[PDB]
Scaffold this active site. Sequence first.
Site: not given
Ligand code: 2HN
Ligand code: 2HN
Lengths: 142, 142, 142, 142, 142, 142, 142, 142, 142, 142, 142, 142
Positions: E22, E79, E86, E99-101
């Site tokens: 990284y 992931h 949401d 993403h860095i990587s």
């Molecule tokens: O945390 C993550 C990974 O889980 C992701 O798949 C890539 C990711 O978002 C990226 O390449 O920026 C990041 C990679 C990563 C790490 F996975 C991590 F453990 C570190 F300590 C870090 F500084 C870092 F950059």
């Molecule tokens: O947080 C979630 C969703 O991730 C879930 O799939 C449906 C869910 O549980 C529902 O319809 O009540 C809810 C839906 C939802 C949201 F996805 C959300 F971002 C809100 F801000 C919110 F107020 C809300 F109700």
Amino acid sequence: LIVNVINGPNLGRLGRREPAVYGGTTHDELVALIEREAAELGLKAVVRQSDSEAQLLDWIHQAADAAEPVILNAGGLTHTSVALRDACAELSAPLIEVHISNVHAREEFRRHSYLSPIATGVIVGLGIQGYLLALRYLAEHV
Amino acid sequence: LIVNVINGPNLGRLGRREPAVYGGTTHDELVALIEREAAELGLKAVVRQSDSEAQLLDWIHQAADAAEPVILNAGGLTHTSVALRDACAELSAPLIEVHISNVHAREEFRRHSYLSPIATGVIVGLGIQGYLLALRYLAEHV
Amino acid sequence: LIVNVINGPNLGRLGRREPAVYGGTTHDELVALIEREAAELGLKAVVRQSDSEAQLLDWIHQAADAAEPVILNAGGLTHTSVALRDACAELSAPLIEVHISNVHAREEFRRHSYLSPIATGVIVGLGIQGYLLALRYLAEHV
Amino acid sequence: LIVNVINGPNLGRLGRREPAVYGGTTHDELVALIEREAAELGLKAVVRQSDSEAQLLDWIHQAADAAEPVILNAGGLTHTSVALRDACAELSAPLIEVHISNVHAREEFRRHSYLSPIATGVIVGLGIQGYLLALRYLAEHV
Amino acid sequence: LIVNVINGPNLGRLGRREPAVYGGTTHDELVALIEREAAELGLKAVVRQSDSEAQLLDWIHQAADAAEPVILNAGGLTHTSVALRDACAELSAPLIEVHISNVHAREEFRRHSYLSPIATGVIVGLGIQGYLLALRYLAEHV
Amino acid sequence: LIVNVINGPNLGRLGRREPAVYGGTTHDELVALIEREAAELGLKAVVRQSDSEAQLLDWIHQAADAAEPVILNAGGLTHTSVALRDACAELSAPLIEVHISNVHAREEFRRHSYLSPIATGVIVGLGIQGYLLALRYLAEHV
Amino acid sequence: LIVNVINGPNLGRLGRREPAVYGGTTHDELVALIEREAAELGLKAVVRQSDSEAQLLDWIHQAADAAEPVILNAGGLTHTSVALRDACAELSAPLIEVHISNVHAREEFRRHSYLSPIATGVIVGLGIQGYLLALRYLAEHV
Amino acid sequence: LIVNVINGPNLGRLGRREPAVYGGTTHDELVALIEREAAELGLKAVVRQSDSEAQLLDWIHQAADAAEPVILNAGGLTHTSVALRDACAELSAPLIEVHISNVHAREEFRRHSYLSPIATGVIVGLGIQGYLLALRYLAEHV
Amino acid sequence: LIVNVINGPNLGRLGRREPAVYGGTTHDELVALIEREAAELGLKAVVRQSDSEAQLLDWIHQAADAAEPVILNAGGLTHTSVALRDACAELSAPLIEVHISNVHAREEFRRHSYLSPIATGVIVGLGIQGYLLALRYLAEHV
Amino acid sequence: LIVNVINGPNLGRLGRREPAVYGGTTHDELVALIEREAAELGLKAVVRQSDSEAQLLDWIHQAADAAEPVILNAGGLTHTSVALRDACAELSAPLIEVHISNVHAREEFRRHSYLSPIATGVIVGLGIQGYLLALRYLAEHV
Amino acid sequence: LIVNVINGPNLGRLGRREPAVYGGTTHDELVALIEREAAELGLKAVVRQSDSEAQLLDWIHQAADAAEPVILNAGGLTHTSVALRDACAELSAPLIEVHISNVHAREEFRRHSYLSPIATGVIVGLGIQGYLLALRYLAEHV
Amino acid sequence: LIVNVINGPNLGRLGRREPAVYGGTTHDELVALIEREAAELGLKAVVRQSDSEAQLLDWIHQAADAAEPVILNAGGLTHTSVALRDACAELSAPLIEVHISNVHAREEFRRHSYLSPIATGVIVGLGIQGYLLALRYLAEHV
Ligand SMILES: O=C1[C@@H](O)[C@H](O)C[C@](O)(C(=O)O)[C@@H]1Cc1c(F)c(F)c(F)c(F)c1F
Ligand SMILES: O=C1[C@@H](O)[C@H](O)C[C@](O)(C(=O)O)[C@@H]1Cc1c(F)c(F)c(F)c(F)c1F
Ligand SMILES: O=C1[C@@H](O)[C@H](O)C[C@](O)(C(=O)O)[C@@H]1Cc1c(F)c(F)c(F)c(F)c1F
Ligand SMILES: O=C1[C@@H](O)[C@H](O)C[C@](O)(C(=O)O)[C@@H]1Cc1c(F)c(F)c(F)c(F)c1F
Ligand SMILES: O=C1[C@@H](O)[C@H](O)C[C@](O)(C(=O)O)[C@@H]1Cc1c(F)c(F)c(F)c(F)c1F
Ligand SMILES: O=C1[C@@H](O)[C@H](O)C[C@](O)(C(=O)O)[C@@H]1Cc1c(F)c(F)c(F)c(F)c1F
Ligand SMILES: O=C1[C@@H](O)[C@H](O)C[C@](O)(C(=O)O)[C@@H]1Cc1c(F)c(F)c(F)c(F)c1F
Ligand SMILES: O=C1[C@@H](O)[C@H](O)C[C@](O)(C(=O)O)[C@@H]1Cc1c(F)c(F)c(F)c(F)c1F
Ligand SMILES: O=C1[C@@H](O)[C@H](O)C[C@](O)(C(=O)O)[C@@H]1Cc1c(F)c(F)c(F)c(F)c1F
Ligand SMILES: O=C1[C@@H](O)[C@H](O)C[C@](O)(C(=O)O)[C@@H]1Cc1c(F)c(F)c(F)c(F)c1F
Ligand SMILES: O=C1[C@@H](O)[C@H](O)C[C@](O)(C(=O)O)[C@@H]1Cc1c(F)c(F)c(F)c(F)c1F
Ligand SMILES: O=C1[C@@H](O)[C@H](O)C[C@](O)(C(=O)O)[C@@H]1Cc1c(F)c(F)c(F)c(F)c1F
């Protein structure tokens, strides 16, 4: 008025190869049948065949600029080409997908078309007459 | 000479429900169009519709005994019924599968038909004219 | 110093087709923007487009022999071509994959690239500016 | 007597790129080895390479008309082309699929060939000698 | 004018752990680079990092109320988190995933992001400069 | 100099059972052909067959201790045995996988081999001559 | 005002069969509970049950023409019928899917409903009271 | 003492259609064979056939109330009906699933039965004698 | 008597964000509606919301020790958290899963809940009234 | 006249282990029942059991040379052995697959047999009487 | 010398909830057992539990900086957290994954761990003694 | 008191083959370590190894009759044998699965064991000490 019939890879081999399967009709005879039926419907068929994806794409491009409908038998590229689908998504007139053989009675890989989702409709398994039936739909839809 | 047009579940609702999608043509008008076009081709169309799988199967059975061709729009059963496929596998004359809508532009579950593998061919997405085009294939194949 | 920008199938149709989606910028204008930005960074952009996989492969080959970096928008071949991936695996300088649209907000088939695993990095969904941002990475990495 | 050796995309890059992997043998040297071994077996090898699917298809077509056997290393198209498979399904003489590398020791996508199901046999991972061994099978099978 | 850079789990460990992978740049240095580049573009970067999903969500909420753009490297939550997606679906200004990587050159589980479908665009594998390039897109898009 | 040819389950039934498929050659004749061809190449073939996985494993073990190459037709165990793969992963000399039939033209379960990933190469569908061709590769690779 | 409660296959067997699971309440008692609760809310419940898909479809059709809301427990057809889904997609008033048992605590095949995607909402696992709760939603939504 | 033999869709077509496959025995002859063999075992066979799922369900219901064993050849519904499985899960006496053809030697979709998991046992591929063998199990299990 | 209503991530954003989708009701108003309806049923609603999984788990723990029923809208964690499911598996009183939106009409990833298999029942797509209907089930089940 | 009953791994443990499941009948008693029933049908049963795949294969080989029918309960190898399937594909007389337990009511891995596709028929879940019923089919089919 | 024992979500509920399953041992008693056994081996156990992923990550970070080994029972996060895996991939001393229950005898979702691939080893299903056995491995590996 | 340690295919090759991976400890030394540690715990270890599934099954059978616990490293059969699982399901004393290597850090096919679901627990990746730790669990569980 103008309709483009576009055949892709291996359709120039029609009427050789596999008599029992696709017909003993050749691609030249196919051109002849289409053109004759097209004139009878009051249309002009431009019928082109190529084994080259680039060529097929150029032809789709021209139909897109001309706002002309397309009857397309892409051959193997039906099942494999995203590029051809992207070109066809531009078409403003109807796109009718045509396969001579029944693709659903063959290998599983042939039962998925990248073209069907964007086509107006699809005719499969009706032999060379599928092209004629596509012409007739196009004639009743102007 | 005789051709059986068989519509399955929900095809009696044609021309209600969803004008933009399947046409504002009703099933009675569809019967009328088919019969008229059939006479013009020198054929007789027997057009029947039912929401009952048992009824559809009885009709396929009769066509099998009579060695008569079938144009079949099974509706939802297209995607779900092994029973209907088994009945149709008996047909000795041609089986043409027809769908008014383009089933490949809808949900994934609609892109698999238990009928296509045993049909002679398939017409989808060409609206009500798909039935007429199936009639014409049957007229050129006797 | 020298950077190769390679566009694949359908990228010549840019600025037609779908204004809302990819921009009303044409491919000639894109060439113009890239070249101008490249000069401003002290680089030379060679920008080439083709609908032919063979042509794209020849261009990748030349960049491989010349040890030149590549910015590549392979179009549909992104999702389908192992051949193009094999050609690119030879590149010793950086390979930056660029897509104008956000491929992850479209169909599922577009969320897999045969190129991403061998690319240095990927820019998607940032419009035509993705090419400019790839140029800038290449400028800061010499 | 006559045997066609057909190499697809990226096989012209042989002997560059990746010494440890495919050999430091170039495609010209490969042509030379094949032709020499072919003469020693009493055969004539026509060895052709192209990055163009259309070109490969034309060559398969000619072998089909001539009833000539084919040794085929389709490169990346091995894993992706239905068109090439359709062309090869016409061949009446033997089709031997050859890969220089062991495709089963690489990425999962390389362990599926659209060609293997229709080939007479397949040789993988035996380096350039796979071509020579295919020649020898063809020599013992006339 | 104001841009929020939000790093998720494990990004505080940057510049320890894995020099080859990284960069030997730490998160404090990253803050410093971003802020400096932001000022040069006429923007203000607010750069925040947390290992707590709740904290990240609070920050996304605030950006949503403020109609501020977000550059987001969610770490592992990229992931796995539907909750974060949401929260981000509310954003009215641009969301750039960074993403860095190169996540597509690692394990298969890293090649799916719950964020990419709702992001404006995505930059991966361009190291710490991906953040700077996201800033520049945001600067050219006001 | 010494080469071990190892046949697994059901290969003792060769030349019975299915004349059209594998040849009317028996396993004793196969032993005879191999040994004769081996002597002609300046090698000694030790050819052994067993329906017992334990026996096959003992033979692989001995080849591992002796640093001797192996030509292996594991029969059904090709598709099912991790134990046999583990034994073969020890081999320091070449391992050539050989199948008389074209396994890719049969059931889907036969198109996966636990051995191919660790073998030097694979010959399938070339009949009994595949063994001879494996011998020849081994002769040219000392 | 008018609400249609439609039970599909096997719901006439309620209160026999499996006391511990669905309740010792019979379908006649269920009719009685629903009707009484409906009157208390100022509604009229028309409660119908059939083991015949055709019958269920006729009832959905009538509710579609009448613009009446439907509470639907399709029984096994929940998991299998595209036909029933197509009929219900016509409904202009609310469709509430109800299951007496918790379908997500049973076999995997029961955790997919063809109806849920087109329903207004779904109540599962709350026993016979799910029907009453659906009535109450319908009463508060006029 | 009393045993119910229930045939589903298309079993009335037995002894037509496909002589080579299921036997030239008709369903009336099948009734006759079963009844005769049943009397010889000291049982009474009630043999019923229907193409209607509703009818089959009514018959299963009656057997459930009567605590009578069932031999069931559901035809196509074997592979598709959850409703029929739910009805049969009520049976307190034995349920023997019978298929005339070997369903495991046909299409993949026929190798899954919703009934097998709840049946006492299954007989497939033993022709019409499977029914007789089911009778004999029932005779030895009272 | 006492009932715990627990909302997870993003439910504090209710009544902002997406008026058309979840309602213009805020979470404070939701608290108010629930509490009022609860008193009318003779219950006490304790309504809590958090974006922190740890907080939600602490609340489930307390309900487990107190043997109190829970109405739970876990937000995104519905689809992703095994930890929350493990906490809830301890509950001895009823667990009712509630979603404001119809999760089965959205993305595929939302149609799987780790909670549904262990919940007493599930209400989805009935808006804020789902909470009230869950209260009423709990009131009729003491 | 002669019939071979072949039991595979763990069938010697019958009548120990799991009384409720397979019966308290031992394998010696099973031999006794089979032989007695065989004599009553005018047949000779040769009943053999082994935990060794090699032994089972030798026995199948002998039945193949002798053109004798086989009743086969392969035990665990049912689900795992391609070798055994290959041996059995040679049999010219009938192969009846028999399982004492209902394999479709157990783990998913037990619902696939490599033997069923090549067997004449299959009897499962009818206990030890399945062997007797297989004998009776063989007696009526000479 | 120093060993970190880290328990994740729901492990504070140990010795409540499910006596038959995980033991009637509480987490305080577990701390006591571990510490005592650790002293007997000449080690110091630091035993920490949290329902907060952020807390667990902070603890893994500290062990990474201190180059200390970790015994980790992540609870539900075992199956769901990429963030925790990323934190643990930094550890230079051994990581031993421990689960009290046999995760392979439960639901399918529990048979995949994001931690196992990067752990030194894994102990499951050996109850609380798994922690003690992990301590002993660590004691014999210094 | 008596404990059976059973090693399957290829475990006799321990201490050859792959020093870096499994240890330079041989199987004879392993026997020696186990027996010595067993005596120190007041147990008797009977340690047996075989490449023959039949032999392993006989040994499991004997342990089943003797009600003796088993420590089992089945080698490759771990991932492939249903027969061995069936034999082990009989064991009334504890079954501890042991793998020297971390099977979850290798190929995907090694991350599924047919034994884990029926074992008491599993130790992987802790080298030869896993056997000793299994002994200690067995010593503390009498
Ligand atoms: O945390 C993550 C990974 O889980 C992701 O798949 C890539 C990711 O978002 C990226 O390449 O920026 C990041 C990679 C990563 C790490 F996975 C991590 F453990 C570190 F300590 C870090 F500084 C870092 F950059
Ligand atoms: O947080 C979630 C969703 O991730 C879930 O799939 C449906 C869910 O549980 C529902 O319809 O009540 C809810 C839906 C939802 C949201 F996805 C959300 F971002 C809100 F801000 C919110 F107020 C809300 F109700
Ligand atoms: O090229 C193809 C196939 O790849 C496609 O699956 C069906 C297909 O589009 C059709 O039935 O028309 C076409 C079939 C086909 C061929 F596959 C082919 F090789 C020909 F030579 C040919 F003339 C032909 F028509
Ligand atoms: O019933 C169906 C669908 O299930 C099928 O997927 C397409 C289908 O066979 C076609 O497009 O013809 C047919 C479509 C369809 C309907 F789905 C439907 F509900 C109708 F009321 C109707 F008139 C109609 F034509
Ligand atoms: O050709 C493609 C697509 O196949 C690819 O999925 C995205 C893609 O690489 C991108 O967003 O740049 C490109 C998108 C695309 C097109 F799909 C297309 F048809 C064009 F005409 C075009 F100008 C264009 F940019
Ligand atoms: O082009 C390919 C691959 O796509 C294929 O998977 C193996 C393959 O057919 C073989 O090992 O021969 C061939 C391998 C290969 C290459 F992938 C490649 F890029 C070359 F430049 C080359 F010379 C070469 F031989
Ligand atoms: O035993 C097998 C098959 O399981 C394998 O799929 C192909 C296989 O390795 C090959 O074609 O050589 C071999 C094929 C095969 C058999 F399957 C078989 F039963 C024989 F009796 C035999 F002589 C034979 F060669
Ligand atoms: O018929 C069904 C099932 O197929 C469905 O999965 C659940 C279901 O819709 C529900 O719990 O209401 C329903 C359950 C069900 C039955 F499965 C059943 F057989 C009955 F006899 C019955 F009364 C009943 F309610
Ligand atoms: O109806 C079916 C098939 O759908 C099922 O897969 C096998 C099946 O249950 C059997 O072999 O008995 C049965 C087979 C079958 C048929 F498929 C069929 F169409 C008939 F007309 C018939 F007489 C018949 F027996
Ligand atoms: O060995 C097996 C299983 O692997 C197979 O799935 C079912 C099986 O073939 C049958 O029900 O007959 C058989 C079942 C079985 C056993 F699994 C087993 F361990 C026995 F000891 C035994 F006596 C027995 F009959
Ligand atoms: O939290 C979990 C599970 O999610 C994991 O699958 C097994 C697990 O890591 C183990 O067996 O140790 C652990 C099991 C588990 C629990 F799931 C749980 F809810 C507890 F309260 C508890 F004390 C406990 F030990
Ligand atoms: O035989 C196997 C593998 O098939 C299994 O996946 C792991 C396994 O059970 C373990 O790590 O103990 C074992 C590993 C293994 C081997 F794979 C092997 F070939 C040996 F020679 C050996 F000594 C050995 F220990």
